[PDB]
């Protein structure tokens, strides 16, 4: 018997193929709701550090689209980790896997319901990881998610990460931890 996750999750992949549509390029790879199917997917899909520039991974709860305009997203925002090229070695894959584990393990406890998903953007000018939440005015939820996520990643006190409302998105910060 498999070990159930609290939620059902969807993994999306965007390929950066310039001779294709964006509908073509954006693929829902798989949905899973057990520990065992998570690892089967993770272990047999490409590492982030190996994607071409412009590719994304998004893990979202079943029935939230990885689009800021989604009902569950439009009012929310994201906690942004920005990585430069020196951390594409040490941090990208580690931070992504830790992010995925935060989501599927429900590491934000009583403020789990505010989490929508998470996205990694591989870009030529430095990668991005973000945790997407549902409502930017829920200060207690957003900030708790922020502190727990930043602790989980082991970022040093010298690194301050910001939360932007999707409707704002340089972009101003509503919250910093």
Swiss-Prot record:
Phosphorylation increases the ability of the protein to bind to mRNA caps and to form the eIF4F complex. Phosphorylation also enhances its mRNA transport function. Transmembrane segments: none annotated. GO terms for molecular function: DNA-binding transcription factor binding; enzyme binding; eukaryotic initiation factor 4G binding; mRNA cap binding; RNA 7-methylguanosine cap binding; RNA binding; RNA cap binding; translation initiation factor activity. Residues 3-6, 39-43, 98-105 are annotated as: EIF4EBP1/2/3 binding. The chain holds residues 35 to 217 of 217 of the full protein. It is linked to Autism 19: A complex multifactorial, pervasive developmental disorder characterized by impairments in reciprocal social interaction and communication, restricted and stereotyped patterns of interests and activities, and the presence of developmental abnormalities by 3 years of age. Most individuals with autism also manifest moderate intellectual disability. Acts in the cytoplasm to initiate and regulate protein synthesis and is required in the nucleus for export of a subset of mRNAs from the nucleus to the cytoplasm which promotes processes such as RNA capping, processing and splicing. Component of the protein complex eIF4F, which is involved in the recognition of the mRNA cap, ATP-dependent unwinding of 5'-terminal secondary structure and recruitment of mRNA to the ribosome. It comes from Homo sapiens (Human). This is Eukaryotic translation initiation factor 4E. The record marks 125 as: (Microbial infection) Interaction with potato virus Y VPg. Keywords: Acetylation, Autism, Autism spectrum disorder, Chromosomal rearrangement, Cytoplasm, Host-virus interaction, Initiation factor, mRNA transport, Nucleus, Phosphoprotein, Protein biosynthesis, RNA-binding, Translation regulation, Transport.
């Amino acid at each position: 018997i498999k070990h159930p996750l609290q939620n059902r999750w969807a993994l999306w992949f965007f390929k950066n193929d310039k001779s294709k549509t964006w509908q073509a390029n954006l693929r829902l790879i798989s949905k899973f709701d057990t520990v065992e199917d998570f690892w089967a997917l993770y272990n047999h899909i490409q590492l982030s550090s190996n994607l071409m520039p412009g590719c994304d991974y998004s893990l979202f709860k079943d029935g939230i689209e990885p689009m800021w305009e989604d009902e569950k997203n439009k009012r929310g925002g994201r906690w942004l980790i920005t990585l430069n090229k020196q951390q594409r070695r040490s941090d990208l894959d580690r931070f992504w896997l830790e992010t995925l584990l935060c989501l599927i393990g429900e590491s934000f406890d009583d403020y789990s319901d505010d989490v929508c998903g998470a996205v990694v953007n591989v870009r030529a000018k430095g990668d991005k990881i973000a945790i997407w939440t549902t409502e930017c005015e829920n200060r207690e939820a957003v900030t708790h998610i922020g502190r727990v996520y930043k602790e989980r990643l082991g970022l040093p006190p010298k690194i301050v990460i910001g939360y932007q409302s999707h409707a704002d998105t340089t972009t101003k910060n509503r919250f910093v931890v």
